[PDB]
């Protein structure tokens, strides 16, 4: 008989990191959570009260409700030919803020600054990113790094 449980296929998913068993450090219980915050999901088996389903392990959602010991996140789930809003309730132990946004916000802070700086400076500025452009010309000095001839090695003396 086939089993389809709330925790099937979780031998290795919810078991703690090596040598990180035990209580949870308090810096999970002090990170404050507001709505709109973008949080990544990662369960620990030590806290069974508030757990997510194995689907939402790995995912990333946006908070919409904040209660005692717990929060609520909206995750969009592909099923069939569309996505569905899933309003699930978790405890704060199965959660961490996403650093993607903490890296985007500082960039906003920075480009706003140099935008307001260029208005004082009397210059125009680029603040769109651009990808890894090709490499430009150069001149390679040959003074100490004079080329060492190479050649393929054989199989004999190697085996």
């Amino acid at each position: 008989g086939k089993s389809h449980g709330y925790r099937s296929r979780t031998r290795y998913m919810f078991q703690r990191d090596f040598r990180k068993h035990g209580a949870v450090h308090l810096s999970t219980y002090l990170k404050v959570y507001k709505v709109g915050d973008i949080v990544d999901i990662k369960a620990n088996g030590s806290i069974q009260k508030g757990m997510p389903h194995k689907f939402y392990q790995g995912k990333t959602g946006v908070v919409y409700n904040v209660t005692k010991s717990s929060v609520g996140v909206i995750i969009n789930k592909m099923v069939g030919n569309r996505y569905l809003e899933k309003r699930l309730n978790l405890r704060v132990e199965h959660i961490k803020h996403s650093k993607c946004r903490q890296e985007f916000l500082e960039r906003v802070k920075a480009n706003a600054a140099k935008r307001a700086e260029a208005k004082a400076q009397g210059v125009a500025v680029q603040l769109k990113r651009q990808p890894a452009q090709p490499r430009e010309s150069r001149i390679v000095s040959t003074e100490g790094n004079v080329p060492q001839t190479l050649a393929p090695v054989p199989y004999e003396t190697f085996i």
Binding site: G22, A23, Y29, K68, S69, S70, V92
Partner: protein, 269 residues
């Protein structure tokens, strides 16, 4: 030990190795209802060394706890007490001191006055009417075993009586009868003062007079007899109501001559 033991050993946290904190307790004292987002949660740390008392008011950050106010028993001599610094009465006094200190640090010394006349009664701080609420702290007794009649619920009482809303019940005060499940305010008023020690003193003073000296050698300094204690500790109380502020010591050295000596004992690599 073998190698595969110490390769796999999970070290507990540092303060659990040191035996100095219970994180099971710390979790439940520190956490707040997340809907109270960044409001802190103030603790009344109270600790009992061998010949000193610490009382501290502690909020919590991610980069370690923060002290709002602090009160050690080694500053009661400023208010008149010179002996028995690890005493139920001293604990009451110290709790009262930290209470009154904080309550004026904030601007609530006048509004919540506590109980300026003690009787040993179970009286929790009430809220003022159409006005600011009382300061709500909690209590962590470290690792101490809660037992009725301990020094630490003395400081619980002292803070409760100074004003800053420490919620508690009576059945770990002294004088509380396990049988009828009620309290004996007279005995508690005694214990607030030297009620459990003055009796021993004035008992030995006509039972065994030399051992009285062996112990209370310092009470024979200024000729402190076993009826002076009400008027000692109550003057201490009034003094603490009066000027609870923390006036620190004078530093004989500016913290660099202090390091200059110990650096030539520290035994570097």
């Amino acid at each position: 030990k073998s190698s595969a033991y110490s390769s796999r050993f999970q070290t507990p946290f540092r303060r659990r190795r040191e035996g100095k904190t219970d994180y099971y307790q710390r979790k439940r004292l520190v956490t707040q209802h997340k809907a109270k987002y960044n409001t802190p949660k103030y603790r009344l740390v109270v600790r009992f060394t061998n010949k000193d008392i610490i009382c501290q008011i502690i909020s919590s950050t991610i980069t370690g706890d923060v002290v709002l106010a602090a009160a050690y028993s080694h500053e009661l001599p400023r208010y008149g007490i010179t002996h028995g610094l690890t005493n139920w009465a001293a604990a009451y006094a110290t709790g009262l001191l930290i209470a009154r200190r904080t309550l004026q640090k904030l601007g609530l010394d006048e509004t919540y006055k506590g109980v300026e006349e003690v009787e040993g009664e179970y009286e929790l701080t009430e809220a003022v009417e159409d006005g600011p609420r009382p300061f709500k702290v909690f209590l962590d007794i470290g690792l101490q075993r809660t037992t009725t009649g301990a020094r630490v619920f003395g400081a619980l009482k002292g803070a409760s009586d100074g004003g800053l809303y420490v919620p508690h019940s009576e059945n770990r005060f002294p004088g509380w009868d396990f049988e009828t499940e009620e309290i004996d305010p007279e005995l508690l008023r005694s214990y607030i003062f030297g009620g459990h020690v003055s009796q021993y003193m004035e008992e030995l003073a006509d039972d065994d007079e030399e051992r009285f000296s062996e112990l209370f050698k310092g009470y024979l300094a200024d000729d402190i007899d076993a009826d002076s204690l009400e008027d000692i500790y109550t003057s201490a109380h009034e003094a603490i109501r009066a000027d609870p502020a923390f006036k620190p010591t004078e530093k004989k050295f500016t913290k660099e001559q202090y390091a200059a000596e110990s650096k030539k004992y520290r035994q570097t690599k």
